[PDB]
Amino acid sequence: DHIKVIYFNGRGRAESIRMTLVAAGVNYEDERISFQDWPKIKPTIPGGRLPAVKITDNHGHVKWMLESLAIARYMAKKHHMMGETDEEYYNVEKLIGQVEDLEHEYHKTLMKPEEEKQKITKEILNGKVPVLLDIICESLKASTGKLAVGDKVTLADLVLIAVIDHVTDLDKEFLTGKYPEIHKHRENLLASSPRLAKYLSDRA
Amino acid sequence: DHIKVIYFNGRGRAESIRMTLVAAGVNYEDERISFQDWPKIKPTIPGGRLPAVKITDNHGHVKWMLESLAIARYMAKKHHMMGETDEEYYNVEKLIGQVEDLEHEYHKTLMKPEEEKQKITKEILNGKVPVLLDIICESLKASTGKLAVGDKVTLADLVLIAVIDHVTDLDKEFLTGKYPEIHKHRENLLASSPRLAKYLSDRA
């Protein structure tokens, strides 16, 4: 099969797809759609929304996958990254839901004028961002291993890395000297996944 | 009149429009179009390309302006930022054309996958970027004043600031310890235009 990740934002909703495929050792192809190319490409994408995954098999047959986080869930489930037990599966979804709430606050500042972006960034950083970070910090403490859920890589580990990079995009010093469990999670995940470390370092 | 700057990129071709209006003391309104809103907004924009300037007068009448650099030229010409003499007008366009060539190389890395962006960035930084910077550096030396052309602010001063920020976007250390005339131009322009300094500092 040939997996093509059709996206637009360099670090948007498609990062959970790539990080899941990178950690699973599955190859893929990046196809970034430009702002000027989107009007003519959108009718070709089922649903008309990005990101989307296009899978082509050895015979040229095409099947389309939508809803970035649903794609990452399916790829992580097939490669044992959604919890081995039902209780671990809940803990994976518990941190994912908390990360989604933090991604929801970060999304409020995207694609706004410079004056409006700084205002909304100023509100969430003094509002729900530190509150949600404490909830995420408590979920990491309740884990049975060095990672978010258990001791091996799950989807909750990868969506957490993406949302923390989004938080640092709003303020590079928001986590400096704070949230030690979040900093130790990145160190433990980077050591537990050498392929994830190479992707993150080469992306920088 | 009410000037609306319809754009998409936070720091793209619309920066020359804003910096020209800021230095001239003319108020404007930012209207950023999102990637998801572009398919339905494009038929409303004459020409179907961004950025574009929408001017509404006291009676609601609308006149449209296209081609970002042509808009900046008209606004700079009306506020005496295109040279007082014909020979100064040539020197303004001389550095603008050299900046456009450097913007042309920077545009090759935009909206590409992470692997492809790093490759093209690696080629221009070892190619035309240092060559064009030397040509821009020599044009600054031949000036009759502390700025790019003469002693007062012109459009060549502002497009140079925008292209240098684009170069630092590719590599923050490309100008460290190199090109002293380029660093002194930003210092002289910031002192010659307090409104430009506030815009640049508030934008950061």
Determine the Cα–Cα distance for residues B204 and B54; give it in Å rounded to an integer.
26
Size of interface A-B (CB pairs under 8 A): 45
Cα three-residue angle B169-A186-A152, rounded to 5 degrees: 135
Print the SS3 string covering chain B: CEEEEEECCCCCCCHHHHHHHHHCCCCCEEEECCCCCHHHHHHHCCCCCCCEEEEECCCCCEEEECCHHHHHHHHHHHCCCCCCCHHHHHHHHHHHHHHHHHHHHHHCCCCCCHHHHHHHHHHHHCCHHHHHHHHHHHHHHCCCCCCCCCCCCCHHHHHHHHHHHHHHHHCCCCCCCCCHHHHHHHHHHHHHCHHHHHHHHHHC
Strand bridging mode B52-56 / B2-7: antiparallel
Residue of B nearest to A35 (CA): B35
CA atoms within 13 A on the CB side of B54: 16
What kind and span of H or E run contains A89?
Answer: helix A86-107
Q: Which two tokens stand for residue B47?
A: 């020409």
Whole-angstrom Cα distance, residue A200 to residue A145? Answer: 23
Taking CB atoms and an 8 Å limit, are B39 and A39 in contact across chains?
Answer: yes
B126 burial type by CB count under 10 A (0-12 exposed, 13-18 middle, 19+ buried): exposed
- From chain A residues 7-66, the ones with a CB under 8 A of any chain B CB are 8-10, 30-32, 34-36, 38-39, 42, 49-50
Q: How many beta carbons lie within 10 A of that of residue A177, not counting itself?
A: 7
Residue of A nearest to B114 (CA): A203
Q: Give the start-to-end residue ranges of the domains of chain B.
A: 1-80, 81-204
Amino acid at A191: A
Residue of A nearest to B8 (CA): A111
Binding site residue list of A for glutathione: 7, 13, 38, 42, 50, 67-68, 101
Residue among A37, A114, A115, A117 with most chain B CBs within 10 A, to mutate: A114
Which DSSP category does A55 fall into? E
The set of long-range contacts for B126-132, using a CB threshold of 8 Å and a minimum separation of 24, is B128/B101, B128/B102, B129/B102, B129/B105, B129/B167, B129/B170, B129/B174, B132/B98, B132/B101, B132/B102, B132/B105
CB contact under 8 A, A30 and B111: no
Residues B38, A34: C-beta atoms closer than 8 Å: no
Mutation target vs B (from A44, A111, A118; most B CBs, 10 A cutoff)? A111
Q: How many residues comprise chain B? A: 204
Tokens of A14: 């498609």
Bridge partners (DSSP) listed for residue B31: B6
Nearest to A32 among B39, B49, B111 (CB): B111
Interface of A with B in 92-111 (CB under 8 A): 111
CB atoms within 10 A of CB A196: 21
What is the three-class DSSP state of A45?
coil
B68 is in an annotated binding site: yes
Of B31, B42, B111, the CB nearest to A39: B42
Obtained via which technique? X-ray
Q: Can you name the residues that pair with A56 across neighbouring β-strands?
A: A2, A62
Tokens representing A124 are 């969430």
The DSSP call for residue A65 is: E
CB burial string B6-41: b at 16+ within 10 A, e below: bbbeeebbbbbbbbbbbbbeeebebebbebeebeeb
Calculate the alpha carbon distances from B180 to A40, B86, B131, B186 in Å. 45, 29, 15, 10
3-state secondary structure B33-90: CCCCCHHHHHHHCCCCCCCEEEEECCCCCEEEECCHHHHHHHHHHHCCCCCCCHHHHH
Please give the sequence-ordered ranges of beta strands (E in DSSP) within chain A, or none if there are none: 2-7, 29-32, 52-56, 62-65
Ramachandran angles phi, psi of A198, nearest 5°: -65, -40
From CA A13, how far away is CA B199, in angstroms rounded? 31
Q: Between B10, B113, B202, which is nearest A32 by CB?
A: B113
Report the run of H or E that residue A179 belongs to, with start and end. none
φ and ψ of B46, to 5 deg: -60, 130
**Overall size of chain A counted in residues:** 204
Nearest to B163 by CA among B104, B78, B84, B91: B104
Q: What are phi and psi of A190, to 5 degrees?
A: -65, -35
Question: In degrees to the nearest 10, what's the CA dihedral of B79, B85, B86, B90?
Answer: -70
- Cα–Cα distance between A82 and A182 in angstroms, integer? 20
Task: Give the pairing type, strands B2-7 and B29-32.
Answer: parallel
Separation CA A165–CA A175 (nearest Å): 11
Q: Which two tokens stand for residue A38?
A: 């989107």
Neighbour-count burial of A105, counting CB atoms closer than 10 A to its CB (0-12 exposed, 13-18 middle, 19+ buried)? buried
Residue B101 marked ligand-binding: yes
Give the C-alpha separation, B133 to A135, whole Å.
Answer: 50
